[PDB]
Design a protein around this nucleic acid. Sequence first.
RNA 1: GCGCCCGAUGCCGACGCUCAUCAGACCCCAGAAAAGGUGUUGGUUGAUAUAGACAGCAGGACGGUGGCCAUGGAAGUCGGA
Lengths: 190, 52, 198, 175, 156
Amino acid sequence: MKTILSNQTVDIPENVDISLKGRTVIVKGPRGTLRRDFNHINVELSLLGKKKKRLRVDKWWGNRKELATVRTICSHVQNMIKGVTLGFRYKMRSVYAHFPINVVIQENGSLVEIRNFLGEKYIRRVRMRPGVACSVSQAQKDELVLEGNDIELVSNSAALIQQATTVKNKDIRKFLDGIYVSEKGTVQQA
Amino acid sequence: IIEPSLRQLAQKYNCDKMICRKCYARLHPRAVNCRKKKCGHTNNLRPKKKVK
Amino acid sequence: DRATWKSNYFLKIIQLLDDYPKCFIVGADNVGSKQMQQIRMSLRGKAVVLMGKNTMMRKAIRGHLENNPALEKLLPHIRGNVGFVFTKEDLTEIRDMLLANKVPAAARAGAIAPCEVTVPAQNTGLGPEKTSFFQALGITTKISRGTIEILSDVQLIKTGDKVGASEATLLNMLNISPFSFGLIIQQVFDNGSIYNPE
Amino acid sequence: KASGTLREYKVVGRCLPTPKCHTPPLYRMRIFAPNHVVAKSRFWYFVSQLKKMKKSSGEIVYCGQVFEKSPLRVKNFGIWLRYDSRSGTHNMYREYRDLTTAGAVTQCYRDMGARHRARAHSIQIMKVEEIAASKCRRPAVKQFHDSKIKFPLPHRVLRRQHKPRFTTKRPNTFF
Amino acid sequence: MPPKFDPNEIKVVYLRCTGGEVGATSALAPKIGPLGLSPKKVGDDIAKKGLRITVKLTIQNRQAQIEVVPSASALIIKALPPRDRKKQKNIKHSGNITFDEIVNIARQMRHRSLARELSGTIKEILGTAQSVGCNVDGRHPHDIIDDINSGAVECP
RNA sequence: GCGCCCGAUGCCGACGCUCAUCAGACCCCAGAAAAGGUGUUGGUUGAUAUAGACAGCAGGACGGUGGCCAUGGAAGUCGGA
Ligand SMILES: [Zn+2]
């Protein structure tokens, strides 16, 4: 096939700033700065407009499995914008039946200690991703609050903590105890 | 204790799944073709047995 | 439906528009199954109701057929679902006989709350369900007179309330929603001039 | 067969005039063959396929190409093909876009052999017609009538084994 | 209400039956007795057909129920003709009994019908809702969609 | 047959197909099937589309209605003609 052209455009909020040297896109706004270098995506990232209204991803002469990438890069940089302008926050509630999950944050920003799991005397020190602040909340009885800017980072750490607390050689249809990502969110809201 | 909210959230991560009858792989309930390649991306599947 | 119902009712709507010297635009963006009939009872005493599945659609090409001057103040009345009523009465009469039942617009799965309305301390007409459809809101409940009654004086209906079918249940039950638009009498065509009925 | 660049010959034939009737009618075919000997033979193939005549009982009255009408006008052809596919005959309607009808048919043969791996001895063309943009139908062709088209040379690379095997710099694969 | 039966404001729509049945409801007169609080004597006073129970109707007097009359021609049609239970005849009859001059009563006491016009449409729901005997036939009549236009057996 | 072994493409070679955590690569000839794949293309046929068709939004998920009326309980009742 080789479709001659496919395009996508993001309308950048003025309150942000974007620099580029080739595929490396760096986004600096209120909450900080992020980088991401898209090598082997092979597209044209262009920035147009007074007050840099719009960004344009263009894929030339692509095949089907290759036009697939354009909106992926759109969504990636979109979530980057969401982080830099708002910041991502994840919330975790730990289900338990007879062994109240005892989660504390051994060091301030990361290194979550988990213990009293199902009766296991096995402590865990789950190492949160760099650039991610963990914070056990208090308005909800059993609540982890993960915060950061790169949704990749916060969500990766999130699934890591969830998966690190699971049963072995047990029925997961009745035994359920453990932590889970519950309600995907941001820092501040419109 | 398994209060109703924690229950019907945990059973989202651990009960509602779709399984490839030839390769035994957990798939999200939307899935129609197994995401593996040793079963052969087959179409037939089954829902996860609901617990007693 | 198919193109068949389209072809018939395109001419049918202009039939009634030509005949009834008073056209009325009422909205069908959000009207539930019972919120429909509780209005449709009093809509028609010497009258007709005809909302649009192809009738209002025909105007999208009527606009260049020129039956009356100033139907381009009812075709630019297209945004949001609207159908029509037709009577021979006044239009203040028509406004008040779509309010002798006070249509509480009902909604689809995944609705949206646009506005704010302070909670009614006594229920506004409940359907068959529990006191869970009360304490999931935040209004305590007691058993009382033939009116199922609630009890709280705080605002938990907020501009920004996350709506869904889980609330459209209680919307077809209690029947008041934050939404606003529906069966209204404001848009009355008698030979080409628009006023402010309210 | 062994296609080079097809040239669109035209052939007219008949059965020999038997004493029963002074002369049978005359038949015209439009046949794509790289040389007119193969044109003649494939004409006999088609004729024996359709009506009961063979070169034994027929003589080839006329045999020569049709020079292309306006070979400087870009024209997009719809081509009605019928081939055989290792499991049964398939009808098929492909589409191409070129200058000379012969070029269109040679493109059809090449891309049938590639995109469908059916040899050139199992393809028998019915029609090739230049048709307008409102009758062209596959999207691959459809994307090439725009009053303005622009697309860069995305990733351009050329020969440097004649230019030295052992150079001291490295190629630029931008412009 | 479904487990508890709070005093309903009568916009609600719910079953009205069980003039005696102890399958698993555990009562005779109301379906609001066990699930609520009420005696069982107005029900047997009503029990003062034809091998059945009486399909009830239920209203709320701010705490309680008073046995209501069948409020449409639909159930008065079941007051005429196999009145034996488990009949069940498509539908309860073939039409050998006068539905004709009795249906006109129910176009005035129907304070409940919605979306009905000048009586040429009032008659629609109130002659179509009941589904007993084809008015006289073994049909399933669709000549009374709108109950004064295409004609019936009741009217000219 | 022509990257090197190995003489021959060190041609501007032309149009395409394909990603293989066992790729594939030339008569006799030394790797196998029935059955599957929303892997990726080509094609046949049938449905619908600006009068917006398709997903995600304004509907709509019952108002008559216990309407027939099974009472084997069932405005849904399944197992109610
Ligand atoms: Zn599988």
